[PDB]
Design a protein around this ligand. Structure first.
Ligand SMILES: Nc1nonc1C(=O)N[C@H]1C[C@@H]1c1ccc(S(N)(=O)=O)cc1
Ligand SMILES: Nc1nonc1C(=O)N[C@H]1C[C@@H]1c1ccc(S(N)(=O)=O)cc1
Lengths: 240, 240
């Protein structure tokens, strides 16, 4: 099929075993649908102690990524990638990732992901080496690895053959499995009823309600259908 | 010091080696500041094939987590945790994580994190076993593991002794390290000037500008100081 190549720059490549050896993503790798290839800046040093950090000009308490080893790793990856590979830097200054963002990134046959450690990377590397800066969320982590893994996992689902909802813009509906009663709680009868049309409508109505209650801002980005407006109005009225 | 305990429920506990064997978080574990303990629902099965998924009532193309193995793993973890441990389910329906959210979660000496696979878990388990539902972002992943790892990494930074900015509400300023020129790009002179006061003000002004340009909504949640209003107005005017 149409595979995907992901180059990764990281001081901790082994972290990426978490997505390449396990589950859906581990299957995608075994089936050559997804390929993840790592370069460690530490391999690109020349001093005895393999120094990969550097002090920031203007002072400040933290450290940055040494420019030369990082720059050399990026260039190597760009070369092994060949043409067309987009270079993504994960950081809290980047564009905020959401599923629309994932769909766009997914359209790239080749990606290179730069995972920063310490307090960041030199701003000049961002201008010259980085095409897009992205954030997986407004929280602060110890490094760009986990966001890179999150990105990889998210886009991998778009690769044909990888998988075996939410696209309506709404939160998911409540799901139920065995047993029929649990701690004296029972499955909603309509799910047993066998009526696929009653069931579809009930699930949709739940999603509308749950989105309304939990994430009302998600509802303003939406141009609801006749049916959805109906079912939401019913659910809003019944919350009284 | 004041350590942290994190119980984890996952079909893929080995994924968590990515945070427990590496970097800052790997150090926190080695120094008993952070403890991560995993229970696999697969260990709680009794059938020959260690079945951990189950069909959803009302039909639908996907699978859910079998209730019994998952429920038994949760209960075991709650018991090993003892009193006070809060139980977090990671999912796209949860409350949206941000750093404020991380600061709150961080105040818990004990956490238990439930990582869902397949298309989710039974809604009745959520009502009875789960205290808080959280999302790391509006994107869809193959499982709750990476969000759980993200959460762990984020809160770990609040544990005293773990670490060795952004709290002003603003994006970070541009950072620079060796060399002084790079691809014919030079370090802003003021960072060389040695004037800690000029430097502080220049960095602040950058953050104000970068927040304004990249994340203007972050600026509306802010009650700017006299100084910040000054420097922002200057930066807005100079964007002309
Ligand atoms: N969110 C994210 N999406 O992508 N990366 C994300 C992230 O958190 N990266 C962190 C490693 C970088 C970082 C930057 C600044 C500081 S600080 N304020 O201590 O100087 C600490 C850590
Ligand atoms: N974001 C997140 N924050 O925490 N978990 C997050 C997440 O993405 N979890 C996914 C495993 C669960 C999931 C749910 C529904 C479907 S679906 N729409 O294919 O039925 C697929 C996957």
């Amino acid at each position: 099929g149409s595979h995907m190549w992901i180059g990764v720059i990281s001081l901790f490549p082994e972290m990426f075993k978490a997505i390449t050896e396990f589950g859906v993503t581990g299957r995608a790798v075994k089936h050559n649908l997804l390929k993840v290839e790592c370069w460690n800046p530490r391999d690109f040093t020349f001093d005895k102690h393999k120094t990969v950090d550097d002090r920031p000009y203007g002072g400040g308490p933290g450290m940055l990524m040494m420019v030369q080893p990082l720059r050399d790793a990026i260039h190597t990856a760009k070369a092994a990638a060949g043409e067309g590979a987009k270079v993504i830097y994960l950081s809290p200054q980047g564009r905020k990732l959401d599923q629309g963002g994932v769909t766009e990134l997914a359209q790239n046959q080749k990606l290179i992901l730069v995972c920063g450690r310490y307090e960041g990377i030199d701003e000049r590397l961002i201008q010259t080496e980085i095409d897009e800066e992205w954030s997986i969320g407004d929280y602060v982590l110890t490094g760009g690895e986990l966001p890179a893994m999150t990105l990889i996992d998210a886009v991998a689902r778009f690769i044909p053959g990888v998988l075996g909802s939410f696209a309506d813009g709404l939160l998911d509906c409540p799901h139920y499995t065995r047993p029929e009663v649990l701690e004296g709680l029972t499955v909603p009868p309509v799910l047993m009823s066998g009526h696929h049309e009653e069931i579809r409508k009930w699930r949709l109505k739940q999603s509308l309600q749950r989105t309304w209650l939990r994430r009302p801002e998600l509802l303003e980005g939406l141009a609801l259908t006749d049916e959805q407006r109906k079912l939401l109005k019913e659910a809003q009225a019944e919350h009284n």
